[PDB]
Amino acid sequence: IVGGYTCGANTVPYQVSLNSGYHFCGGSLINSQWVVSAAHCYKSGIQVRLGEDNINVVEGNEQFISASKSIVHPSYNSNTLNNDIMLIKLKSAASLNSRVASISLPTSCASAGTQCLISGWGNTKSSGTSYPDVLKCLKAPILSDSSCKSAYPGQITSNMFCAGYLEGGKDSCQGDSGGPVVCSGKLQGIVSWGSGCAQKNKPGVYTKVCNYVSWIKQTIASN
Ligand SMILES: CC(=N)N1CCC(Oc2ccc3c4ccccc4n(Cc4ccc5ccc(C(=N)N)cc5c4)c3c2)CC1
Ligand SMILES: [Ca+2]
Numbered sequence: 001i002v003g004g005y006t007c008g009a010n011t012v013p014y015q016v017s018l019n020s021g022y023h024f025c026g027g028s029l030i031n032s033q034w035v036v037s038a039a040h041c042y043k044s045g046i047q048v049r050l051g052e053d054n055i056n057v058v059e060g061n062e063q064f065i066s067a068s069k070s071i072v073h074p075s076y077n078s079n080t081l082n083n084d085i086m087l088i089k090l091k092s093a094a095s096l097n098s099r100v101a102s103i104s105l106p107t108s109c110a111s112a113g114t115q116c117l118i119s120g121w122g123n124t125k126s127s128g129t130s131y132p133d134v135l136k137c138l139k140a141p142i143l144s145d146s147s148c149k150s151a152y153p154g155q156i157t158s159n160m161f162c163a164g165y166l167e168g169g170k171d172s173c174q175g176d177s178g179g180p181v182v183c184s185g186k187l188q189g190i191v192s193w194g195s196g197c198a199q200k201n202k203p204g205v206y207t208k209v210c211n212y213v214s215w216i217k218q219t220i221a222s223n
């Protein structure tokens, strides 16, 4: 997150860190046994870390649970990032508390201009590299589809939306991938891609979750 603020210890309780010996992507807990992240974050040997603030210090609220199963969306296209979503099932159920909570699936898509909260442990530099230890937060509005498509000609699909600032300075970045985009208390997006980070006229692109609700519900019920 570029141009964000320090959220504060367990302020985004559904935020998950995917670890494979190091943090490599964010995720969102949708229930005691399932996490939603991006298909581009797919990897073997995933450990899910819940209730994390500072990823390099154990402050005692953490729950480290191995993944038993990974399911990348059937139509995921690594070339275009269309359908950038994966489900991750936990070996054992997480213990929900004030620090570890699940986020609800959206019942409908959100409108352009709706304010959202994006979070993660990604790079905080527009151009440079500086990874934080504590979770960063950022408020950003959903952009109009026209603005999104104008910004990335021939690359935006109906499964994507843009959020951020056209004037740049604030965005998600590498390290935030797979992370939640929460608008009006529902998971509306997943940090997917972009052109650099916080650049003028290059907002963040997010997987449009509301398109995936029956897929998520059905997949979960059968696994
Ligand atoms: C050909 C085509 N249709 N494309 C559509 C868009 C897609 O963009 C991509 C595709 C793949 C990768 C990729 C893979 C490994 C490591 C870093 C990679 N990056 C850079 C990358 C990755 C994640 C981001 C999250 C947020 C932001 C952001 N500004 N908020 C930028 C990111 C940049 C990519 C950007 C690939 C090109
Ligand atoms: Ca801390």
Ligand SMILES: [Ca+2]
Binding pocket: 052, 053, 054, 055, 056, 057, 058, 059, 060, 062
């Ligand atoms: Ca910690």
Ligand SMILES: [K+]
Binding pocket: 173, 174, 175, 176, 177
């Ligand atoms: K990334």
